[PDB]
Amino acid sequence: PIGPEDVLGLQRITGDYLCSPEENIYKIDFVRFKIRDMDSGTVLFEIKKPPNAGRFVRYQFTPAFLRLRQVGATVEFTVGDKPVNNFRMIERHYFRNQLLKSFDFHFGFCIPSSKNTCEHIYDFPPLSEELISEMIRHPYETQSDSFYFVDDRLVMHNKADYSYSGT
Numbered sequence: 363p364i365g366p367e368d369v370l371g372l373q374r375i376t377g378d379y380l381c382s383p384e385e386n387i388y389k390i391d392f393v394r395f396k397i398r399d400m401d402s403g404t405v406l407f408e409i410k411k412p413p414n415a416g417r418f419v420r421y422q423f424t425p426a427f428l429r430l431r432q433v434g435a436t437v438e439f440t441v442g443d444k445p446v447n448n449f450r451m452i453e454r455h456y457f458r459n460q461l462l463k464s465f466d467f468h469f470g471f472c473i474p475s476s477k478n479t480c481e482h483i484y485d486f487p488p489l490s491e492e493l494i495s496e497m498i499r500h501p502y503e504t505q506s507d508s509f510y511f512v513d514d515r516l517v518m519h520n521k522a523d524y525s526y527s528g529t
């Protein structure tokens with residue numbers, strides 16, 4: 363039902379998850395996530411996996427984050443026995459229902475029944491100063507949808523919100 367063309371034009375965060383966890387028929391499970399700033403080598407965030415059912419994440423960042431040029435994302439995941447072809451993530455970010463950027467990453471070849479490592483390069487959009495001020499000023503109103511497709515079918519959907527106020 364849901365293909366990449368259904369999400370590629372969205373101008374708002376979705377009101378609900380567009381797929382159920384049962385539709386993840388390929389048993390894809392993300393187990394590690396690490397963010398590196400390509401201009402300082404600084405690790406900006408790193409986690410390792412031990413209602414929303416774990417499909418929502420809250421992120422606490424700093425104001426400097428909104429001026430980064432390029433960020434390297436290291437992602438580790440396991441895969442079931444079904445071979446996976448045309449694995450694709452489409453991740454859209456919004457502040458106050460205004461599209462900031464949409465990232466389209468095609469995964470490399472996925473080895474079934476095994477752990478895989480992939481690297482995504484995030485080229486940040488140049489954000490206007492007024493938009494920078496408002497995202498710092500109103501935490502958690504920057505939101506994202508991450509859509510995962512295998513052979514042009516929605517199989518995973520995650521959500522997140524973001525703070526750029528530090529802690």
Ligand SMILES: C/C=C(\C)CC/C=C(\C)CCC=C(C)C
Nearest residue numbers: 428433455462463484486487522
């Ligand atoms: C799976 C990854 C995430 C849930 C968050 C990582 C997203 C980014 C690093 C993009 C930041 C967007 C801007 C407009 C600055």
